[PDB]
Swiss-Prot record, chain A:
GO terms under biological process: translation
Gene Ontology terms, MF aspect: structural constituent of ribosome
Keywords for this protein: Ribonucleoprotein, Ribosomal protein
Family: Belongs to the bacterial ribosomal protein bS16 family.
Cellular component GO terms held in the UniProt record: cytoplasm; small ribosomal subunit
Domain of life: Bacteria
Gene: rpsP
Organism: Mycolicibacterium smegmatis (strain ATCC 700084 / mc(2)155) (Mycobacterium smegmatis)
Protein name (Swiss-Prot/TrEMBL): Small ribosomal subunit protein bS16
Curated annotation (Swiss-Prot), chain B:
Covered residues, full protein: 63 to 123 of 124
Organism encoding this protein: Mycolicibacterium smegmatis (strain ATCC 700084 / mc(2)155) (Mycobacterium smegmatis)
Transmembrane domains' residue ranges: none
Biased composition (Basic residues): 46-56
Family statement drawn from the similarity comment of this UniProt entry: Belongs to the universal ribosomal protein uS12 family.
Protein name according to UniProt: Small ribosomal subunit protein uS12
Subunit description: Part of the 30S ribosomal subunit. Contacts proteins S8 and S17. May interact with IF1 in the 30S initiation complex.
Region (Disordered), start-end ranges: 43-61
PTM sites of type 3-methylthioaspartic acid: D27
Function in brief: With S4 and S5 plays an important role in translational accuracy. Interacts with and stabilizes bases of the 16S rRNA that are involved in tRNA selection in the A site and with the mRNA backbone. Located at the interface of the 30S and 50S subunits, it traverses the body of the 30S subunit contacting proteins on the other side and probably holding the rRNA structure together. The combined cluster of proteins S8, S12 and S17 appears to hold together the shoulder and platform of the 30S subunit.
Taxonomic path: Bacteria, Bacillati, Actinomycetota, Actinomycetes, Mycobacteriales
Cystine bridges: none
From Swiss-Prot, chain C:
Species this chain originates from: Mycolicibacterium smegmatis (strain ATCC 700084 / mc(2)155)
Protein name in UniProt: Small ribosomal subunit protein uS4
Quaternary structure and interacting proteins, as annotated: Part of the 30S ribosomal subunit. Contacts protein S5. The interaction surface between S4 and S5 is involved in control of translational fidelity.
GO BP, sorted A to Z: ribosomal small subunit biogenesis; translation
Alphabetically ordered keywords of this record: Ribonucleoprotein, Ribosomal protein, RNA-binding, rRNA-binding
Keyword Ribosomal protein carried by entry: yes
UniProt superkingdom: Bacteria
Span list, region Disordered: 1-41
Xref: InterPro entries: Ribosomal_uS4, Ribosomal_uS4_bac-type, Ribosomal_uS4_CS, Ribosomal_uS4_N, S4_RNA-bd, S4_RNA-bd_sf
Gene that this sequence comes from: rpsD
Family membership: Belongs to the universal ribosomal protein uS4 family.
Swiss-Prot record, chain D:
Keywords: Ribonucleoprotein, Ribosomal protein, RNA-binding, rRNA-binding
Region ranges (Disordered): 1-21
PANTHER family per the UniProt record, alphabetical: 30S RIBOSOMAL PROTEIN S20, SMALL RIBOSOMAL SUBUNIT PROTEIN BS20C
GO biological process, alphabetically ordered: translation
Family to which the UniProt record says this protein belongs: Belongs to the bacterial ribosomal protein bS20 family.
Positions with biased composition (Basic residues): 6-19
HAMAP family recorded: Ribosomal_bS20
GO cellular component, one term: small ribosomal subunit
Protein's name in the database: Small ribosomal subunit protein bS20
A GO MF label: structural constituent of ribosome
Organism, as annotated: Mycolicibacterium smegmatis (strain ATCC 700084 / mc(2)155) (Mycobacterium smegmatis)
InterPro entries in alphabetical order: Ribosomal_bS20 (IPR002583), Ribosomal_bS20_sf (IPR036510)
RNA sequence: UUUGGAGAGUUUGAUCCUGGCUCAGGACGAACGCUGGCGGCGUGCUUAACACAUGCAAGUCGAACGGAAAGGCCCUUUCGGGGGUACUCGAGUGGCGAACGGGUGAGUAACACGUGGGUGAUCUGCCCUGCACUUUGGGAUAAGCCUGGGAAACUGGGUCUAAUACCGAAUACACCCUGCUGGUCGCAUGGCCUGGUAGGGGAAAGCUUUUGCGGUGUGGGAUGGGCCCGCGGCCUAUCAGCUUGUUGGUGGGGUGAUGGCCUACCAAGGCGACGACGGGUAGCCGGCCUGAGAGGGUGACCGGCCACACUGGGACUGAGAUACGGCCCAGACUCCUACGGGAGGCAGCAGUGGGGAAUAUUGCACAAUGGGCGCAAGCCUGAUGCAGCGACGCCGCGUGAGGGAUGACGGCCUUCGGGUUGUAAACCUCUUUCAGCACAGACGAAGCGCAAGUGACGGUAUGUGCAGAAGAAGGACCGGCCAACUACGUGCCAGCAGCCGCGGUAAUACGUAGGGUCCGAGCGUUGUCCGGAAUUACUGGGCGUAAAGAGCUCGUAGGUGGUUUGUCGCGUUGUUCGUGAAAACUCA
């Protein structure tokens, strides 16, 4: 009865969550078999990262992900990829790239001079 | 065990509450434990203004 | 917890001027107090103590701050003295002082603590703020219109701005490019003695 | 015995334990019936007795009274006994 | 092919050697005295495995059944209430959960733990994926009603009822046994080829009309486990022999499993100075501290295993039991008691009595995650998520600044010239961080439901305005080790002290004043562990006079060995593969 669980790591004001495959009788922060993904709620991009191949293998061998893990699977594209109904679509949004410090410095120098 | 009495004055007598610590005195042979100054029934010495925290006396006003 | 007492007394006691505009020091170079003229036995401990006191009380830094500065410098791959002096100069107060926007370390530290400057467009108010290579420091309009800041920027005729520091315009923008070298810093006193003592 | 859940579990345990004891008594009766049959040294009476015993043990394994491996090993023991003797 | 070792004081008229003692650093699950503004982060019974008031810490299904005590609707009403509805459900049968989760370290010198394998000798519900299916008959009872003891819990007797509850029979040849009969392997029996052949036997329950779940036997996954093995890891001969199922083998019993595991019959042995049996201490590991290194101490939190639930025995359940809020028995304690008889185990979350130096509030929520039940909605969760108290430890910020005099009061010295606190201060200006008063006000929730909503934290955090330098600093030391001195008061009295050692009238060492040094919201004292300690010296040392060749011989176990030839690959060395979880330390 293996189910994918979220392990509470990080800091109180901005929690950090991993995505782990482990037995249902293990701990929230204890025994783990593999580390496959993560979740970042503090960043409003809401960065999502997951190993598609490992997730697919676990779903095939018969994992029973919980509701939040299944929601993350929909968000990334893994659940609908497995089911094959709509296909493979990526709803994830990447973090906005930070403008380069070098170009910021160049613009500032140009403005100054 | 033995017990040493620091300060220029004291009010200790038979059947009195005492708190002690460890400290060697060269002159007298067998004393190694010193009575804390200004605790329980023992009060701090008077006319003390400097080196005050060691002997436990209140600050002047 | 900053230092409130006199700034001239430390210079008088340690025998070398610090601010450089101290008239009382040159007036009475002898140690202050009732028996400053008395000879003092020379000792390596005395020498090391005087050097470290000079450095710490001249830069106004706190003792534990200096201690972990030293530990970080020692852990740094480069030579401990160079790392220590570079990280110590990296302090924003000294950065602005050598940029010439400030006339004294105490007033510079107060200005930084109150936070009249802008760091990368975000207001930061930390007197011991870490400043790294290739950074940008900005100035707020509430500081530009401030009277003493105007006096400093229109009377900046102090010692020349070092190599790693340079001002670009009237906005008083300070930039750092490369890693200072002991020789081109040419800071007074010596660091070998201090590092030896802290190794002791 | 503090709350309704565990008192009910108690009740059920004792009841179905009475049932369990009855069934185990039946199995043990079959076992020693075979024991004294072998001791006497019967052949056809032993044949039908062991047929009944195997039936009972198989049914017990089916309804979970005894481990099916336990029943199989017991049956193999009966076979070895009847063939040696 | 890279990383790193410091000393000082102390025996003598003066010198050296060995060697003892003390100090300069780091750390705490800390305590004490004094002081004490704010924000952020972790942590809080090491003693009595002492005794415990109290409130909670495990329930869910009408889509299983009999039914309606309390609700809703529709029939009715005299407002006592009379019928159906399953929306809803008290209690009762029937499934599942309940060995999960959470605490502690008395017992152990042991496979218990890590490490690497074996299991041809092993089992395994709930999941997934295949194969053939899933006939029939019957008794009984809870419940409800009548009734007895009795305040009590609970209990005896009579009547009565349904189910997936219980019990016969329908096949099953993918299953299990016994007799006869072929190929491979070696790990030896014997295993495998689902080898082949003759005989024997092996079970089911329906509901629902909806994102459907169930019932029997067999093949494979994945987790879950069970047994065993080589190596490792305290002290102690002022503990020399121990053992009779003890050692080895044959027939039976037994469990799932091979097995002196047990029984009956045979043989007398096995382990022992390469430390048995005894005595003392103690849970173990990833780690932490110290240390360049080897080395030494330690098991905080967190992470993985072992064992325990007042003490001592026993057994059933189940796929699973040291069965902490399951059961039977023996002892101590407590409570109710109408004196007929009953009720109890906070080393679970809070809290009470004692211990000591000490360790907390009888606080708020399922808002996110995990777990349990049900098709789902839905229900429980002292797990978990948060708040309050403790300067216990870690990080950060505040109590101002520019100019201001050969330097205004007051104080102490003075050689009576004069110097000190002092750029300090009064002063002219400044923005005033955080507190203070108002406004807005979060993410944490692409989440839950087919509802129309959903944040305990918190109206905190965080931004936008208002007033004012307006509210904010103390503790040790100043003979040398050991950064820092003057005056005054009593002098072998009163007193200081980590070592050297300081007072017998002119003390920079006692007490008080000024001045200085150190630290800083912390400052000092105590305790513990490492270092310097080459002061247990394998890497690092000695034994003539400083501690040390037994008063001399003979001789067992071991260590060790002259020169050469062949062979083995045990020691040694090279290459490659598996593993060394997470967390931990370093680099970016
Ligand atoms: Mg996010
Ligand atoms: Mg009997
Ligand atoms: Mg049958
Ligand atoms: Mg190194
Ligand atoms: Mg001497
Ligand atoms: Mg002498
Ligand atoms: Mg020696
Ligand atoms: Mg020596
Ligand atoms: Mg206080
Ligand atoms: Mg902040
Ligand atoms: Mg705390
Ligand atoms: Mg209670
Ligand atoms: Mg239930
Ligand atoms: Mg009910
Ligand atoms: Mg069910
Ligand atoms: Mg358990
Ligand atoms: Mg169970
Ligand atoms: Mg546990
Ligand atoms: Mg404890
Ligand atoms: Mg113990
Ligand atoms: Mg016991
Ligand atoms: Mg023993
Ligand atoms: Mg083992
Ligand atoms: Mg183990
Ligand atoms: Mg009944
Ligand atoms: Mg019926
Ligand atoms: Mg049945
Ligand atoms: Mg076959
Ligand atoms: Mg058959
Ligand atoms: Mg049949
Ligand atoms: Mg049937
Ligand atoms: Mg299968
Ligand atoms: Mg299988
Ligand atoms: Mg295993
Ligand atoms: Mg082994
Ligand atoms: Mg070992
Ligand atoms: Mg034996
Ligand atoms: Mg015998
Ligand atoms: Mg057996
Ligand atoms: Mg035997
Ligand atoms: Mg280290
Ligand atoms: Mg080590
Ligand atoms: Mg140990
Ligand atoms: Mg422990
Ligand atoms: Mg642990
Ligand atoms: Mg017990
Ligand atoms: Mg107890
Ligand atoms: Mg006990
Ligand atoms: Mg069983
Ligand atoms: Mg089970
Ligand atoms: Mg239980
Ligand atoms: Mg309890
Ligand atoms: Mg408690
Ligand atoms: Mg007490
Ligand atoms: Mg949860
Ligand atoms: Mg959940
Ligand atoms: Mg749902
Ligand atoms: Mg509840
Ligand atoms: Mg509740
Ligand atoms: Mg605090
Ligand atoms: Mg405290
Ligand atoms: Mg405390
Ligand atoms: Mg000033
Ligand atoms: Mg603020
Ligand atoms: Mg949110
Ligand atoms: Mg969001
Ligand atoms: Mg002195
Ligand atoms: Mg001196
Ligand atoms: Mg004194
Ligand atoms: Mg003193
Ligand atoms: Mg005098
Ligand atoms: Mg002073
Ligand atoms: Mg601080
Ligand atoms: Mg060493
Ligand atoms: Mg050292
Ligand atoms: Mg050593
Ligand atoms: Mg020592
Ligand atoms: Mg010799
Ligand atoms: Mg001799
Ligand atoms: Mg001899
Ligand atoms: Mg001799
Ligand atoms: Mg000999
Ligand atoms: Mg010999
Ligand atoms: Mg030999
Ligand atoms: Mg030789
Ligand atoms: Mg070899
Ligand atoms: Mg690892
Ligand atoms: Mg690391």
């Amino acid at each position: 009865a293996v189910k994918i669980k979220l392990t509470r790591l990080g800091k109180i004001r901005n929690p950090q969550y991993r995505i782990i495959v482990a037995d249902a009788r293990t701990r929230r922060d204890g025994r783990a078999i593999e580390v496959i993904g993560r979740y970042h709620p503090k960043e409003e991009p809401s960065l999502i990262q997951i190993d598609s191949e490992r997730a697919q293998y676990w779903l095939g061998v018969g994992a029973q992900p919980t509701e939040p893990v299944l929601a993350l699977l929909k968000i990334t594209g893994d659940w609908q990829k497995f089911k094959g109904l709509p296909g493979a679509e990526g709803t994830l949004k990447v973090k906005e790239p930070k403008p380069s410090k070098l170009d910021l410095f160049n613009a500032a120098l140009a403005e100054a001079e | 065990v033995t017990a040493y009495i620091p300060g220029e004055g004291h009010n200790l007598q038979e059947h009195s509450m005492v708190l002690v610590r460890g400290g060697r005195v060269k002159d007298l042979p067998g004393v190694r434990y010193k009575i804390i100054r200004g605790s329980l029934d023992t009060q701090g010495v008077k006319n003390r203004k400097q080196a005050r925290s060691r002997y436990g006396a209140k600050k002047e006003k | 917890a900053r230092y409130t007492g006199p700034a001239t007394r430390k210079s008088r006691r340690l025998g070398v001027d610090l601010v450089g505009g101290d008239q009382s020091f040159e007036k009475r170079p002898y140690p202050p107090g009732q028996h400053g003229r008395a000879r003092i036995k020379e000792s390596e401990y005395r020498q090391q103590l005087q050097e470290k006191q000079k450095a710490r009380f001249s830069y106004g830094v706190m003792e534990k701050q200096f201690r972990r500065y030293y530990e970080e410098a020692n852990r740094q791959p480069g030579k401990t003295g160079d790392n220590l002096l570079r990280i110590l100069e990296s302090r924003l107060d000294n950065v602005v002082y050598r940029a010439g926007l400030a006339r004294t370390r105490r007033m510079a530290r107060q200005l930084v603590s109150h936070g009249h400057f802008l760091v990368n467009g975000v207001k930061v108010d930390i007197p011991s703020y870490r400043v790294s290579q290739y950074d940008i420091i900005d100035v707020k309009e509430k500081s530009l219109n401030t009277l003493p800041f105007q006096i400093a920027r229109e009377t900046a005729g102090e010692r020349p701005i070092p190599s790693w520091l340079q001002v670009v315009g009237e906005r008083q923008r300070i930039l750092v490019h490369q890693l200072p070298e002991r020789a081109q810093i040419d800071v007074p006193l010596t660091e070998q003695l201090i590092v030896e003592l802290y190794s002791k | 015995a503090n709350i309704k859940s565990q008192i009910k579990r108690i009740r059920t345990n004792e009841r179905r334990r009475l049932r369990n004891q009855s069934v185990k008594s039946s199995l043990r009766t079959a076992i020693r019936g075979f024991r004294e049959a072998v001791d006497a040294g019967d052949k056809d009476k032993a044949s039908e007795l062991l047929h009944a015993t195997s039936r009972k043990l198989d049914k017990a394994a089916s309804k979970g009274v005894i481990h099916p491996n336990q029943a199989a090993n017991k049956k193999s023991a009966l076979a070895l006994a009847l063939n040696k003797l």
